[PDB]
């Protein structure tokens, strides 16, 4: 019932800039933080962002602090991730999620959209 | 203005309830976490209960657990306190208060609504 | 050394209602929160209420918020879910859990029990 | 001495901007979280914006989200409070202050800095 | 009534200990995190340290940090700090203090104890 | 890019003592709490202490407690367990882990260093 869908990923240049949404439905959406979770090939997920349920809050992980702006609308149940100066290291699956003792199992998170950064 | 209007209180007698309410106006309700703060006479304010800005987490002090219940209606801008099997050392001026990073200063609470528990 | 061992699941009805227990022994119970993860057929777990050492805060996801309550009594080292109004999408295997970066690793979970909603 | 110097404050037309600085010694600043405090005429101090000891982690009141953006160099020991879109309501001696469990007294806050907010 | 005492102040020399001792009652001490609380001459109160209701987490003020140590006895409702390497500068009135969402209104604190250190 | 590197494992009699060391690079080591994970034979992991990033704070499984100690300097940017009064249920794989919304995935932690307690 809880879904969570992306949309915003695909190929884009060193440097360039990209925004992912990610739509949620089934659970009040200003009720719960929110984060984006990165997978890089073979390597294991990792929070990278995340954002309170009113949007008062946001923690950033080293890797994406200064690039990179989580944000949502309530009003419009979506939550964002502005990513800027993007680099190679970005490459990967990005997916969000909903919090949880940290974020929820991996059963609930989006669909999965992959960000590729190539010249 | 950020506004807190109390109301609810009066005169019980011991073992009676009470339903205290809270309006709020001024700031986005369900953003913030929200307390009941007592003021017994002669007493320091102490804060007897805590819900989250959902309303999906609530707090309660020892002196109030099992007996009061704090809910919140986000569609109104309504916090509540249920108070039953209620006794003379619950006779207080109640507030209700915004978190700050814990509670609010004392300017933003109500003008508060004094319950008096007596035979 | 840790153990959780759950009691009181079964068969119930559509909008019955039924209370889950958790015995726990091998740590001071009142030293850690607790809380119960919902595993339905074919879906990830999921934490679905939580309550602090003392019992003095409980939180509740918004698919049980109204309908369960998480209690327990550190006299009786045991915790409880009183499970109301249950429904067809409540049928699940009911796990308990001490609480850990969020919750501890499945191997350390009550042993399962499982709920089943059939008129 | 825990020591810390605010300034940057002054005279601004409503729309206009300002930066307001806060210099920290006496303690290592890194270790701290740090709010921004207002204090404006006739009102109770109300913290508007906390960052985290890292800076990885931010948090903006309601009245000052989408104009405020707090920030620190820990390198430098000084913290910052980016004003925008200020109007007459932001008028008020602006103060840091290190997080205690929650804000630290007020005597160990600044002298302050006035910002005054007019035509 | 809740009620908090302090005692094992004193006199002491510079680099000597003392251990501060504060005894609880009216209240499940275990359900309650608690602090120590700092007020020197002419200074605001500053709490120094904080340990969980179990026991199990603990916190030190930078000023403090590895020479005193707070610990906690439940079953005999005692909170205790092992002050050493005592310096002039840790002259002051001691007072234990129930977590509130952050620190309990003074109100609340003991009558305190006299720590002096002197040649 | 981040790497966390554990040394100091190895055999230990019964009653011994044995200081684990987890050196840290590719990011600001003082930015994030850390934690000792273990890891018996056959067992889930577990999160037997955990540090804040400043050194402030530490936190301790019941397990441990009493015996254990978790420590870092960050100007040498490593983090250490000081275990003591080895048992022969200490007997496990430890990992160094950064937090995360509780740790990160195991991907991230330490390459893990056994600890063998036996006569």
């Known amino acids: 019932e809880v879904q969570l869908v992306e949309s915003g990923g695909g190929l884009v240049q060193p440097g360039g800039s990209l925004r992912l949404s990610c739509a949620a439905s089934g659970f009040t959406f200003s009720s719960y933080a929110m984060g984006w979770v990165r997978q890089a090939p073979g390597k294991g997920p990792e929070v990278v962002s995340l954002i309170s349920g009113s949007g008062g809050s946001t923690w950033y992980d080293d890797s994406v602090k200064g690039r990179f702006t989580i944000s949502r609308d309530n009003s419009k149940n979506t939550l964002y991730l502005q990513m800027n100066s993007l680099r190679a290291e970005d490459t990967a699956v990005?997916?969000?999620?909903?919090?949880?003792?940290?974020?929820?199992?991996?059963?609930?998170?989006?669909?999965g959209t992959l960000v590729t950064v190539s010249s | 203005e950020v506004q807190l209007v109390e109301s609810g209180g009066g005169l019980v007698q011991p073992g009676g309830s009470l339903r205290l309410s809270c309006a709020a106006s001024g700031f986005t309700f369900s953003s913030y976490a929200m307390g009941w703060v007592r003021q017994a006479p002669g007493k320091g304010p102490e804060v007897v209960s805590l819900i989250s800005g959902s309303g999906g987490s609530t707090w309660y002090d020892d002196s109030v657990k099992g007996r009061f219940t704090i809910s919140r209606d986000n569609s109104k801008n309504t916090l509540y306190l249920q108070m039953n099997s209620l006794r003379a050392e619950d006779t207080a001026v109640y507030y209700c208060?915004?978190?700050?990073?814990?509670?609010?200063?004392?300017?933003?609470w109500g003008q508060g609504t004094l319950v008096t528990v007596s035979s | 050394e840790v153990q959780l061992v759950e009691s009181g699941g079964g068969l119930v009805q559509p909008g019955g209602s039924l209370r889950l227990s958790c015995a726990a022994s091998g740590f001071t119970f009142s030293s850690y929160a607790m809380g119960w993860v919902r595993q339905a057929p074919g879906k990830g777990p999921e934490v679905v209420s939580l309550i602090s050492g003392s019992g003095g805060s409980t939180w509740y996801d918004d698919s049980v918020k109204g309908r369960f309550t998480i209690s327990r009594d550190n006299s009786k080292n045991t915790l409880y879910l009183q499970m109301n109004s249950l429904r067809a999408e409540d049928t699940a295997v009911?796990?308990?859990?001490?609480?850990?970066?969020?919750?501890?690793?499945?191997?350390?979970?009550?042993?399962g029990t499982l709920v089943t909603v059939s008129s | 001495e825990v020591q810390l110097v605010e300034s940057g404050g002054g005279l601004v037309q409503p729309g206009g901007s300002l930066r307001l600085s806060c210099a920290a010694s006496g303690f290592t600043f890194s270790s701290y979280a740090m709010g921004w405090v207002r204090q404006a005429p006739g009102k109770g101090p109300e913290v508007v914006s906390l960052i985290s000891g890292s800076g990885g982690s931010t948090w903006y009141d309601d009245s000052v989200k989408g104009r405020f953006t707090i920030s620190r160099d820990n390198s430098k020991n000084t913290l910052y409070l980016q004003m925008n879109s200020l109007r007459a309501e932001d008028t008020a001696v602006?103060?840091?202050?290190?997080?205690?469990?929650?804000?630290?007294?007020?005597?160990?806050?600044?002298?302050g800095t006035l910002v005054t907010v007019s035509s | 009534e809740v009620q908090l005492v302090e005692s094992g102040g004193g006199l002491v020399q510079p680099g000597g200990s003392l251990r501060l001792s504060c005894a609880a009652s009216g209240f499940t001490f275990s359900s309650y995190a608690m602090g120590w609380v700092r007020q020197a001459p002419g200074k605001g109160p500053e709490v120094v340290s904080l340990i969980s209701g179990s026991g199990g987490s603990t916190w030190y003020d930078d000023s403090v940090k590895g020479r005193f140590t707070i610990s906690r006895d439940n079953s005999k409702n005692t909170l205790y700090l092992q002050m050493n390497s005592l310096r002039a500068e840790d002259t002051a009135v001691?007072?234990?203090?129930?977590?509130?969402?952050?620190?309990?209104?003074?109100?609340?604190?003991?009558?305190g104890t006299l720590v002096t250190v002197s040649s | 890019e981040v790497q966390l590197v554990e040394s100091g494992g190895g055999l230990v009699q019964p009653g011994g003592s044995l200081r684990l060391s987890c050196a840290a690079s590719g990011f600001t080591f003082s930015s994030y709490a850390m934690g000792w994970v273990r890891q018996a034979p056959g067992k889930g992991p577990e999160v037997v202490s955990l540090i804040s990033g400043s050194g402030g704070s530490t936190w301790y499984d019941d397990s441990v407690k009493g015996r254990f100690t978790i420590s870092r300097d960050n100007s040498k940017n490593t983090l250490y367990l000081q275990m003591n009064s080895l048992r022969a249920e200490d007997t496990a794989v430890?990992?160094?882990?950064?937090?995360?919304?509780?740790?990160?995935?195991?991907?991230?932690?330490?390459?893990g260093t056994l600890v063998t307690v036996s006569s």
């Open positions: 208060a915004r978190h700050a990073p814990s509670t609010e200063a004392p300017d933003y």
